[PDB]
């Protein structure tokens, strides 16, 4: 449609707030529309992933975004089934999780409620990780899987809990998901660099960044 093309054109120009406001104005931010038009959902998730947060937007747009990424709404449950159901598009699954994180991080004010939703997200994500490495064994998106685990560690365990990075976060996840380390050690981003190797290296770099970057400013 012409109106959908207008939204796409705003996205191409990185007028992301205007893109989302137009989607809201025309009624596209709606699970019923998402189910009937996969590319409308794809645009919505991609645009929301670029927004620093959802807090500076108009009230109507904000309420419609929150309905899609608040974990216990009917619309979020349905959207999650659609996005997590396409195991071939792991990078979009990762965008969706980042959008859920953005709601907890910036739209929630009560730390007790933030913790409550963070724990819910942890279960959703760890359950999905098991599904992915089981159902897509032999057909793993190595780069997407590295990104997924690093969202869990750096955005959820570190950022949402306000907790310093540690290799123990990786080993703890592997003890709850015993299939994980074998999978990640056997898949390679490059010669002699497994996903596990890369994640542990990322954790080490993040530790040094956390310790030193502000000192150097």
Author numbering: 43 to 259
Can you provide the manuscript's text about this entry?
Pex15 and its homologs are tail-anchored proteins with poor sequence conservation and no known structure, yet they share a common function in recruiting the Pex1/Pex6 AAA-ATPase motor to the peroxisome membrane. Here we show that Pex15 inhibits the ATPase activity of Pex1/Pex6 because its cytosolic portion is recognized as a substrate, engaged by the pore loops, and completely unfolded by the AAA motor. Pex1/Pex6 then unfolds Pex15 and any N-terminally fused proteins by processive threading through the central pore in an ATP-hydrolysis-dependent manner. Based on these findings, the current model is that Pex15 recruits Pex1/Pex6 to the peroxisomal membrane and directly links it to Pex5/Pex14 and potentially other Pex proteins.
